[model samples]
Target chain A: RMKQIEDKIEEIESKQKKIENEIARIKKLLQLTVWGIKQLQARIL
Target chain B: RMKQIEDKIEEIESKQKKIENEIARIKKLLQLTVWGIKQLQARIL
Candidate 1:
């Protein structure tokens, strides 16, 4: 029972790590895109 | 055994659902903000 519980905890931790990574990646990507759009807007008009 | 497994599965599913909703909300908010930024940028310069 203890081993089973430990394995479950590890699995959940892995999932949490993946979720955090994905959120961070998307945030960075969005920020870069916004920066690029601002530069384009400046040049366009 | 099956009940325990199912309980873990449900917990994980709920967490995933919450995370997905959060991601969706963030994306929507960012999109709106980006649109606002573009509008402001165009007006400013």
Candidate 2:
């Protein structure tokens, strides 16, 4: 019982880390896009 | 560059919170231990 639950917990932790990492990566990409837009606006103006 | 990453640390921390909370809940459910297993043992196993 302990082993079964711990194994599931480990799997959950692994997936949880992955989704957290994905959100981080998406946030970073969003920031970069915002920065690029700002630079582009400066050039266009 | 590095600042870009360091700023995201807190963002990821928040994501980690949500993830940890969900995992904790599921883990707690699993700890119920016998709450649902009787059915599985009779019907599936």
Candidate 3:
């Protein structure tokens, strides 16, 4: 019914939010790692 | 009831694809941004 549709949409939205947060977390970690590499290379050169 | 579930699952699947695509796009952009920043820093240092 309509209620079921609402529930399904809500579930999808929640899952979407979770994925977005995870992506953000991964991106931050990647940025830090890449920056660290860059720093090391600069120091070595 | 089975049909309902199937349809809902399909809808969710399509949405998941969209979310995944967007995440991929964002990750690539973030990677590019980090690379740009590192290059800039290397030039300065």
Candidate 4:
């Protein structure tokens, strides 16, 4: 039972890593989009 | 004064509807994800 639980824990950890990587990538993309919007809103002076 | 308050309430209603839709969507997707996980676990067993 312990071994089975360990296996499931590893499986869930892998999924968690994938989800975290996706979230990190999305955050970077969002920051880039926000920067672009800020640039567009700037005065051309 | 009452007219201004009424206008603000209408705007908030729009926001409320949008928020409700988002909540509904998240709930449905959560249920679908749970179902998918159960299937995955069954296959593993």
Candidate 5:
């Protein structure tokens, strides 16, 4: 029973890590997108 | 002991939910940003 609980905890922790990594990637992409928008604005306006 | 484990699981689950919510919000924002960029491109180019 305890072993099963431990396995479950490990699985949850792995999922949490994956979520964190995805968030990090999205944040970077968002930043890049904003930067691109600024560059376009500067060129056009 | 089992009670403590249950409590920990609950805490972790709550955190997971929060992370999921944040990801959803970011996804929406990213989509909006992309849309805005396209609009600007259409107007300028």
Candidate 6:
């Protein structure tokens, strides 16, 4: 039914938003990790 | 009407797969970044 499809699509859309937000959060952690490595290198060198 | 909905759902599903793949790739990168930082810290300490 069309209503079922609408609900499914809405659910997927919500999931997509959550997925995107998680990716964004991971990206920030990656950047911070890279920065931390650089700082360690600078100190050691 | 149903056909249009099917097409839209297919399109979104394909996009979702791509997004999921990107997240997987980013997760790997984040893990590697964290590992690299640990290695640097070990050396410095």
Off by over 4 Å in 1: A1-9, A17-45
- Write one digit per residue (lDDT tens) for candidate 4, span B1-45: 557556655665665566566556556655655665565556556
lDDT string, candidate 3, B1-45, tens digits: 868786867888797989788887877887786787678678767
TM-score of chain B of each: 0.90, 0.53, 0.89, 0.89, 0.94, 0.94
Which model scores highest in TM-score? Answer: 5
Among residues 3 or more apart in sequence or in different chains, the pairs in candidate 4 whose N, CA or C atoms overlap within 3 Å are: none
Best by lDDT: 5
For model 6 the interface RMSD, in Å, equals 1.0
Residue-wise lDDT of candidate 6 within A1-45, one digit each (tens)? 968898987889798889979978997897788789778978977
lDDT of 2 by residue, A3-36 (tens): 6655755676677678878666755665565566
Task: Tell me each candidate's i-RMS in Å.
Answer: 4.2, 20.5, 4.9, 18.1, 0.9, 1.0
Reference-based lDDT, each prediction: 0.78, 0.59, 0.78, 0.57, 0.87, 0.85
Which lDDT tens digits does candidate 4 get at residues A1-45?
Answer: 656655755665566566556655655665565565445435321
Residue B5 lDDT, candidate 4, scale 0-100: 50
Q: Report fnat in order of the candidates.
A: 0.12, 0.12, 0.12, 0.00, 0.59, 0.82
Those runs of model 6 whose alpha carbons end farther than 4 Å from true positions after fitting are none
* Docking class of predicted structure 4: incorrect
Q: Model 5, range B1-45, lDDT digits (tens) per residue?
A: 988988888898898989889898989989898898888878877
C-alpha displacement of B14 in model 1, angstroms? 0.6
What's the lDDT for residue A3 in model 5?
Answer: 95
- Which is the winner by DockQ between candidate 2 and candidate 4? 2
Query: Which predicted model would earn the best DockQ?
Result: 6
Off by over 4 Å in 2: B1-45
DockQ for every model comes to 0.20, 0.06, 0.16, 0.02, 0.61, 0.67
> What CA RMSD would candidate 2 show?
22.1
Off by over 4 Å in 4: A1-45
Off by over 4 Å in 3: B1-9, B14-45
Q: By descending lDDT, how would the candidates be arranged?
A: 5, 6, 1, 3, 2, 4
What would the TM-scores of all predictions be?
A: 0.59, 0.48, 0.57, 0.49, 0.85, 0.82
